[PDB]
């Protein structure tokens, strides 16, 4: 059973999903993701859905994405019957197996049967140039823990052509 400390020192994207979707006995379900340019107020990306492979998104961003000063990332998720203690996300972003950013966020308690929201209001010229040249080599792993137990692993790659 993988834990936070197990993914905090990873130096590359994982070649495989680190838990089976059955691990998700809390029925944490992401039903909406939205990304906003805080300067112009343009929605850059939105995906919605009611209410060991896990989830995957291939994002289609522009070269300008990488020059933005401020972005807002919103998540909505519903939760099942059981309480969820110590809900926690670690998200690691890699370009060509070289860590770019790590986000470690402690959501806390999730009330049984809830719809919850989290909004986060959050680069070298050679890095920008290489990332625009090499689509889908920017990759991310999102790990969700519940009381230090991995229950969900989502993956993503990114384009900036």
């Amino acid at each position: 059973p993988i834990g936070p400390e197990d993914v905090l020192g990873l130096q590359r994207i994982t070649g495989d999903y680190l838990c089976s979707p059955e691990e998700n006995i809390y029925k944490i379900d992401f039903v909406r993701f939205k990304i906003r340019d805080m300067d112009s107020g343009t929605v850059l990306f939105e995906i919605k859905k009611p209410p060991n492979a896990g989830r995957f998104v291939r994002y289609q961003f522009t070269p300008a994405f990488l020059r933005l000063r401020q972005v807002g990332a919103t998540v909505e998720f519903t939760v099942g019957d059981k309480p969820v203690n110590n809900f926690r996300m670690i998200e690691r972003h890699y370009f060509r197996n070289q860590l770019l950013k790590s986000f470690d966020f402690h959501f806390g308690f999730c009330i049984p049967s809830s719809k919850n929201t989290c909004e986060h209001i959050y680069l070298s010229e050679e890095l920008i140039s290489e990332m625009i040249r090499h689509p889908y080599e920017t990759q991310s792993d999102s790990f969700y823990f519940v009381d230090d137990r991995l229950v969900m692993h989502n993956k993503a790659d990114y384009s900036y052509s």
Partner: protein
Amino acid sequence: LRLLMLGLDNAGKTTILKKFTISPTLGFNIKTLEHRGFKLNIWDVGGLKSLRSYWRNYFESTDGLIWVVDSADRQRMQDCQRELQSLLVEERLAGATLLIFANKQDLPGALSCNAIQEALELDSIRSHHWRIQGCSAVTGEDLLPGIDWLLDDISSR
């Protein structure tokens, strides 16, 4: 910094979170942000009767407690008073600075700040720093100055 935003259902907590297309919160809304050179993590927890026993699940580590009042909801002020005083005796909130937003000041019969101060029994409070601040959450009026004061007070510690 960790801020916890509570009050009765319909008080305008979520409206506040969003302004500083809207629905009753059956669970929470977190907003995370840089302001006055601080990383602010804010939890807007729902206020309908049956969510309230789960409030205590967000007490730990709170620096700043925003209590939000529908100032026209005069039939429920005493429930609001009642809910507030409980929080204040909870050991996990021993630290917190208290900011009261007396919301919906735009509504014709909105109780004044002073009326709310008397009704909520704010003078009884010996043990947390506090400020009552009128606002209309729908307009954006009087929110930041309210928060700004919260952070400065927390910032002294």
